[PDB]
Design a protein around this ligand. Structure first.
Ligand code: FAD
Ligand code: FAD
Ligand code: NUY
Ligand code: NUY
Ligand code: BR
Ligand code: MG
Ligand code: MG
Lengths: 486, 483
């Protein structure tokens, strides 16, 4: 019942901290989660959101969806078959995803039993006091105590949860959680939101829709994928449109009613209507702090509801730390993992290390995908007197042959033009997520544009574009866009 | 006609050098090549080997070959279609490739038309004297004189040429050159060689072969792809085999005869025999110096037949330079291009620059592909007291579902374990050529393994393997491997 470290949430950050503490520092660790394997009722489980209802199943389903483009694109390279026989079997996809996720769930169960001092507890973690976590049977604080855990150190790693707008008929809508378990592929679907989850799902549903199907993505503002490079945001919008997805910008559901056939009558704020079989809400995720009962020990939360932390993932309460999505910063698995690894190398390895939240490589598995690291030019331009933007945008030759002429590859390098330091790299096109990883390492090494252009290209690749750009396309000078420096 | 620079060979290096000299340094530039567009009879042409009968068309054809895997792999993700309707139409591939290559040929044609101080001459360039290039009708130096070009400076940029073993029946075999123009896909094909061209073409032929077809690759040595990471060599061998390619190692053709139906009867040195429709020789490429009459000026060759150069691409004859494959250093388009730019900067810019032939990222467009940059462990182990290998090898999750469970991704980082400096990164699997590019930039910046594992992964990717390795898999200490 006594532990060096108790972790609430067996997810991306929680497991990295737990396993590191046990295996690197022979520490004694409790990890709490509400569920041992994926899906209803609590969706996230042992392994966390990414494993159960996030990156892992999403990427398998985007990979499935990509075959729609490969089957069509194959014809340009001389592949011939009965196009009229082509069917996308969603049920097969979901069964294959379910088996993949379950094997990971079981892989983590093995990890806990096999590892000394690493113990899993099923149920709901909350804080009784500074040094006691209570595991209950439900998220109700009044339910039965299964366990009382003594903790020299407490890690909050409970992640996030979909936000559902409080509109009439929200109960007819799903989140990404339910999207992973739809028994049938929707013929018509409204993905609500302009972020990566709405965009990724629009692509999935677009590939698997039955005949006479239609994917609509709505976003309340002017242009999807706020926080990404502007050129890439416009381009993804075109390329999604090109592949039959309808993008409704400056539009937002005001309500949903069931039609008598079970379908959804969406009324927009603009007064427009749309009938769809599924309304998937992907408008944001919010930290899971409620069920932890943080009032009991006075852990300070931020305006937006995320656990306030310093650079070392420390709360205002000594011995109590918080990593990953509960901190409501960068909601990425590898950031959660990095924070957990750093927190444990600090507290238990006596080797203080802080996560760098700058120059983080990330991806959108849009079709085609985004790979990005560091600052967008708008952001750079406000911090630096002189910003250069290097840009190469073209339909790769293979997509001239494939027939997908709309698949413009975009490579942008944003620099501090005063010294050539690379501030950001922004890619749209096949392989962007793979290209961008080692760019992350480059930015950590303070790479300049000349480090890229003096490296010899790998030919033929999309990636060599990054090593072929010597001359700015344009600049920002004290915030002002211009073709040429004064 | 008199030029600051005459370039013999309108290829990767030759065009970089000529365009740079003309446009950046304002020099009057002549460039010579034997053809304005791709294919028979001389195969290479305006644009060079890469454009016409190398990197560009081969990448298009491997992309085509990859759909064989995508169509089969689609089923695991729920895709359904009539498998028996599936045909690989080679003729369509070749026509698509030919248009793509011809478009590049035409654009280079327009570049010469529209670029003042940059002139193209059609025919065979050779040295008459140290300041005169003669362009003739044919490779034969007795053929008719089309031009005589006065040159302050002469760049030899004629590239390389397939090596053909002098065996009985060599005339019944082709090289990569002819392979790009086969009118029909061979039912049975022997690729001879364990290098990237043999392996890449074995993949191409394997996808487009007519029903009941068979691709065989033979190699004199024990394990294909010498120079590549040994784990990757063993895995690519397995993964080719798993996709129906017959790998015959320790085998080499002794001779070829025509069977009565006109197929090729192959006699291997081991006595063994194989009947194939095509024998593609991919055993090496040799510098193209024969036709240049370098004897007229005394440019020093190696016994190989490459032009000897210093680090600045200077021959023993002042004002005569060589870059690209003709120099037999690193036979890659981007190296040729880099050498060309570096030469012109040195000579016409007084900006002294030499190509770094170390830590050059390269790829093999095998199925699945290889991306590599820097030293393999065996090499690092002879030059460094302590070498660490970080290795991650596994079937990606998507290939459990696809049914291609043989498709092991391999990521390996080789370090100087004394300071953690990355010496080499070696990748096998989907994306590897795309992943390795920015790794080339890392190695230029003296990246250490700690720079990799302190970088935050992009997830889910194959590339994040590079940023998730904390702990060596094994070591070499004074050349000896220690788990
Ligand atoms: C659809 C989708 C796609 C995504 N795609 C990507 C992607 O491609 N790449 C990427 O990097 N990130 C992606 N993410 C984000 C990623 O899933 C999260 O950033 C990551 O899971 C956060 O990890 P964490 O450690 O904060 O918590 P999680 O991994 O969310 O783990 C939290 C765990 O805590 C448990 N829990 C919660 N409350 C309690 C309690 N009171 N007691 C006990 N257990 C509790 C939950 O059951 C859960 O298992 C995606 C997210 C979603 C929703
Ligand atoms: C099948 C194959 C695949 C390849 N794949 C890749 C790859 O994926 N990536 C990569 O980086 N490299 C690849 N390469 C290598 C790449 O093609 C070469 O390294 C590169 O083309 C060499 O450039 P260069 O300037 O030295 O010569 P080249 O580009 O070969 O140009 C030489 C030119 O000179 C002309 N010429 C020859 N003799 C004369 C003469 N006497 N007078 C006039 N003109 C003459 C030829 O017609 C030719 O156009 C491949 C090569 C082959 C054969
Ligand atoms: C390697 C680098 C030079 N890029 C090759 C691919 N690429 C194109 O497709 C185009 C060629 C000309 C106009 S667009 C952009 C440039
Ligand atoms: C980034 C790092 C954690 N890797 C994740 C992917 N990966 C696997 O999928 C494995 C499957 C089989 C054995 S491991 C290897 C490890
Ligand atoms: Br060998
Ligand atoms: Mg245990
Ligand atoms: Mg001209």
């Amino acid at each position: 019942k006594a532990f060096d470290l108790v972790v609430i949430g067996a997810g991306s950050g929680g497991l990295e901290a737990g396993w590191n503490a046990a295996t690197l520092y022979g520490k004694r660790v409790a990890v709490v989660d509400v569920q041992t394997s994926h899906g209803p009722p609590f969706y996230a489980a042992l392994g966390g959101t990414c494993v159960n209802v996030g990156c892992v199943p999403k990427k398998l389903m985007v990979t499935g969806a990509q075959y729609m483009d490969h089957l069509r694109e194959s014809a340009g390279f001389g592949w011939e078959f009965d196009g009229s026989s082509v069917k996308a079997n969603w049920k097969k996809l979901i069964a294959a995803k379910n088996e993949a996720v379950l094997d990971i769930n079981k892989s983590y169960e093995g990890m806990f039993n096999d590892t000394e001092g690493l113990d899993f507890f099923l149920g709901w973690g909350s804080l009784e006091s500074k040094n006691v976590v209570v595991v209950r049977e439900t998220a109700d604080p009044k339910s039965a105590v299964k366990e009382r855990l003594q903790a020299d150190h407490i890690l909050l790693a409970t992640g996030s949860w979909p936000q559902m707008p409080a509109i009439p008929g929200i109960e007819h809508c799903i989140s990404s959680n339910e999207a992973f378990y739809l028994p049938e592929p929707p013929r018509r679907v409204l993905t609500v939101g302009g972020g990566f989850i709405s965009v990724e799902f629009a692509g999935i549903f677009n590939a698997y829709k039955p005949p006479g199907g239609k994917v609509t993505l709505c976003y309340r503002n002017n242009l999807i994928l706020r926080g990404f490079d502007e050129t890439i945001r416009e381009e993804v919008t075109k390329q999604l449109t090109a592949n039959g997805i309808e993008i409704m910008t400056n539009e937002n559901p005001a309500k949903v009613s069931l039609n008598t056939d079970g379908s959804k009558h969406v009324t927009f704020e603009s007064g427009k209507t749309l009938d769809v079989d599924v309304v998937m809400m992907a408008i944001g995720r919010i930290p899971r702090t409620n069920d932890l009962q943080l009032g009991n020990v006075g852990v300070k939360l931020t305006p937006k509801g995320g656990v306030q932390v310093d650079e070392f993932s420390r709360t205002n309460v000594p011995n109590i730390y918080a990593i990953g999505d509960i901190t409501d910063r960068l909601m990425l698995t590898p950031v959660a993992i990095n924070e957990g690894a750093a927190l444990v190398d600090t507290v238990f390895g006596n080797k203080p290390r802080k996560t760098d939240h700058t120059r983080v490589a990330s991806a959108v598995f849009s079709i085609p995908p985004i790979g990005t690291c560091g600052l967008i030019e708008e952001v750079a331009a406000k911090e630096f007197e002189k910003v250069a933007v290097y840009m190469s945008s073209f339909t790769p030759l293979m997509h001239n042959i494939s027939g997908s002429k709309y698949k413009k590859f975009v490579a942008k390098i944003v620099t501090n033009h005063s010294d050539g330091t690379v501030l950001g790299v922004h890619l749209l096109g096949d392989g962007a997520p793979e290209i961008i990883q080692a760019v992350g390492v480059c930015l950590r090494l303070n790479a300049k544009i000349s480090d890229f252009y003096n490296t010899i290209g790998v030919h033929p690749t999309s990636a060599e574009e990054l090593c072929s750009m010597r001359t700015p396309s344009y600049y920002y000078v004290k915030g002002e866009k211009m073709e040429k420096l004064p």
